[PDB]
């Protein structure tokens, strides 16, 4: 269940990165040494995702069925496979961070891997 939470946090970070086209929040998350830095990124990335939801540029979908998130940014279309974190996942993840900030680095490494694979595939098709 800890790995599932970390994977859902990594999906949130990857969606926020692909939508904003900025690595800055993922960099801050993977370099965090305190719960303050982690929590600030968790808010700021969800605030970016909230704008994408309100603009209908971020939407949940199913793809062949697996749960996925469609992201439209600057005329590029991306699809992240998996769920976004629940409020309980954020709370349980913050408790994991209060024990060991290592889990922020693990989620950041996964998020960057998701984003890199999607960006590589999108450039190849173009």
């Amino acid at each position: 269940e800890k790995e599932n939470i970390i994977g859902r946090i990594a999906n949130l970070l990857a969606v926020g990165f692909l939508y904003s086209e900025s690595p800055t929040l993922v960099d801050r998350f993977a370099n965090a040494l305190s719960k303050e830095a982690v929590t600030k990124v968790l808010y700021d990335v969800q605030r970016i995702v909230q704008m994408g939801i309100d603009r209908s540029e971020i939407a949940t979908t199913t793809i062949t069925d697996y749960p996925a998130v469609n992201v439209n940014s600057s005329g590029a279309k991306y699809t992240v496979v998996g769920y976004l974190p629940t409020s309980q996942d954020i709370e349980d993840f913050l408790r994991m961070i209060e024990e060991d900030v290592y889990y922020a680095r693990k989620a950041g490494a996964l998020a960057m891997s998701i984003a890199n694979r999607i960006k590589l595939g999108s450039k190849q098709s173009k």
Binding site: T24, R28, L33, A37
Partner: protein, 316 residues
Amino acid sequence: MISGSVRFLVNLESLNGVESIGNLTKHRTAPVVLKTSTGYLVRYVPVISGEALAHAYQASLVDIAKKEGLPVGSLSSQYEFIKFSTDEALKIEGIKEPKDYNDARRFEVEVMLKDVIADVGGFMYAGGAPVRRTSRIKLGYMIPALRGDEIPAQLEAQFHVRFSNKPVAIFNVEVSSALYTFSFELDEDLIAVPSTFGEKVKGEEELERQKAKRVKSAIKALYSLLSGNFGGKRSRFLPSMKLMSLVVTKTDFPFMPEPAHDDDYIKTTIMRLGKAKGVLNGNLAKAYVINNEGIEVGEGVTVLSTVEDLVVKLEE
């Protein structure tokens, strides 16, 4: 010997740098082991290397020596402390390399009568007859206090852009804020004294004549370190520094004050100094304390107000 422990509070700081990734300039970080009520933990905390402090101290010593008429080396006149390591430095200065072991002392004296920096900070020559001289000033890394369960330090990144009328210019800078602590040691009883064993060599009389001035200059050079004139990126990221606590001990026997990690580290070091003087059969032990945070000190302790008074008292 003169041994000191100093506590500083610095905000919005970037004086030490490391390798950069992309458009991001990183701040030096190190692992620390800290004790909490739940056991022991490992954390990553920004730190500052001691080599910058040594460079600042040596530059201030160069300035003071040039002002007071003491000899300064040709290469050391410019702020480049290669000293006498390579053969190019020897050729530039004009000192013959040692022939055998028995000549090594002579070479040391020749190095010691030309540059005060080589005398104080030590030097190394590698070759057929290697020559070594350990530094007379010892410093360490600048680490924030590991007090309690929460480390009083923070690091973040900041965004900057360069303006241009024809876009074709964006970078990031790491900034930290912490409560740093560091300790230093300086043995003034070995300044202007040769270290290589051997026979008497002409030229030691001049060293004996200049010993007092060299010791005075070495003591004066600590003002820059105790004031806050060190580190880089001071042109646009000038830090805000404020002294909080300082302990200085002058002894005739080896001694090490307690690190500035606990709130009570002055009473403990004073008691340890008294007991060490009692047990080691010493003949001199003095302590000076500067306090600006209202923590426990003790009894029968001289209390100062600034750092200049401490420097004057040490000189006298």
